[PDB]
């Protein structure tokens, strides 16, 4: 009945399909775990999306956001590496424990990002940066594409983030193409927030903050995620669409409703303009599958209507409601309604402190109550979150830094010039 | 759908001391906090006061010590408290609770 | 969880004729699972025939085979049949039974066409035309 | 994932009525189609009454209008009132979650239906 059907130990020999040395894109290989179709977990510190940021040592205490915590120790013993992957993989159980992120795990996996990389209009081909390298025990590599790559922190420990590789000239996560999503996030720390009551010494699930990312990644990897331009200028620092629309609630209805229904318009657009790029069609290339294999498969991605005559469309409503799961169902304050856990009530709650974690036993951390375990004294009032009833399982690193007590008044900053 | 309505706003002298009213439909004063700004014809929309659903208060310049703004933690209804009011106070009253705006009560001196 | 595959049926015949290969299950499920089956001559690549998903009948079959060979599921007692019609000696080959476990299954999705998406995998059984 | 439950059924003379009842308190219900199957012993699991989330109801021709499905997004129920029944409806009704983009499948345990 589990989301990943293998028991993973981090020490367990490579065989090349599922436990495998890889290499991204842009080194010599890592070993990574395939937890799922699509979706891989590299226990490792990311020094490897972005080798300007392959340094694990603190910058300069100026340079240093008030929010950040540092610790080029951490995720390097082969116990550390084999805890993380434990831990990621019970918070993807987690997720999939509610029917919220089930659905949102399957948008997941059937989000291939799109065979849109030919310079011939008929031909379908892949996008080499949605593909990591897979060593074979033959020593040669394999191009294997997937969706979602689960990797340690870089310096920063505590910014968690959702990245993709792009395109020269195209926006992969904008154009409704999609790309293969890398996720810095660590199951090993948690983030306390101060909610008051209607004395706030309670701390987030981390499942909602993978959860987070997933939405994120879920966002980018059907090519509907906002411009990381749009961005609302905070006063009394700034706040994108894409983070307010994330977090949903009452958050999301800092979009207007004509930004969104825009948005609703460009993309039933982009879709029936990939659904016609499907139709016109004639070539494949570099693949043992057909074109109509290819076609069907991006069909069931983006739910496309098939006509008696293998012509694709899409069903107005079909697309409205699968643009209304990605973006308005698939919210953190959805998966914090689901959970049925405490949490940060807008995501302008800039305030964080810093807790170590382990919640990979059972007796910390379940997959269908998280801290708040059956039956005990934290079921009641949410006290597996209260670090200090809970003490055995929250371990304070950094202290709240009191910077962000104050009203955030948003105001959207306007069009500027880039390069 | 939420909502912010706003009341007390009238004609005030400048001895005597007003108070406004913001209340909403599903407590949001709790997530974000509250602010109140007034716009004057002839100037710009001014913050005038901000307090968190923590109730640290913050006040602009101008106001400083005659504005007063309360909250009262559980409470859905937010109050701002103005004594010794002077002509600077002639302006439309608008309260703010993250994304959702009131639609004013205007203020006017003798 | 784990699922165990044996494959029988694999013999001599001549060209042109039928023949039908068993995939026996035996795990806990099955649910959610895609059933594959691959042909290897000793020496090439180990190719893909065909593949279905066993919860919604979703069907895929290779050039190769397209038209000639046909999927059959039993869940009377938990087994996969490759139809095997209109036999050519390009076909002799050791048949591979695999499955893959993915959540989207379910439905008319299509199932996997590539070797490293299965995980589960059987002995395989020789044809010879 | 989630246990689904119905409850309601039982015996009734025949000419009756009943209500069948299935809570899916824990799943999305919007982007499914709940509906209402028919299982006689011997016979195949039939279609019964489907309605989707706007309201649109689906009825099968073995229904003459005898069956009224009701959805309640709220509390995230339905209902399924059954009127004139007949020896033919004799069967165990299961309540099924159908999601609108064909993602996966719920079904419920059943509950039994019989009229003499
Ligand atoms: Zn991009
Ligand atoms: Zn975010």
Redesign the interface.
Known sequence: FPFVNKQFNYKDPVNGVDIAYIKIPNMQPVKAFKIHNKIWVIPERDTFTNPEEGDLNPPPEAKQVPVSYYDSTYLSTDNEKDNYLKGVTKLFERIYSTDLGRMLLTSIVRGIPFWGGSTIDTELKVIDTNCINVIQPDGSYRSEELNLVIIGPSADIIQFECKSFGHEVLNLTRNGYGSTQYIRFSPDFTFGFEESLEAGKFATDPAVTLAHELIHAGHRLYGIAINPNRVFKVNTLEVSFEELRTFGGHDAKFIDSLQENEFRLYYYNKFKDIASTLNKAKSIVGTTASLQYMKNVFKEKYLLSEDTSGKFSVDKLKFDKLYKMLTEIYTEDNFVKFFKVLNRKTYLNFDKAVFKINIVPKVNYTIYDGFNLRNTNLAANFNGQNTEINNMNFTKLKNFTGLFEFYKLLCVRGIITSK | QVQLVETGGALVQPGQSLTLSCTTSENVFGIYGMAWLRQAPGRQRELVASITSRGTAHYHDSVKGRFTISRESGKTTAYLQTTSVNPEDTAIYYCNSGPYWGQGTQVTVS | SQVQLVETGGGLVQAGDSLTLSCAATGRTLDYYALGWFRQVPGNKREFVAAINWLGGSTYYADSVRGRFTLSRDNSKSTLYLNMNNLIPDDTAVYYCAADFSIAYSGTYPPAYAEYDYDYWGQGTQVTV | ??QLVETGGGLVQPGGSLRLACVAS???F??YTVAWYRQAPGKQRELVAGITDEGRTNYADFVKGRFTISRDNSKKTVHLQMDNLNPEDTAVYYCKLE???????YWGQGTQVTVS
Request: glycine share 8%.
């Open positions: 994932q989630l824990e799943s999305v919007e982007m999601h609108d983009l064909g993602y996966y499948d």
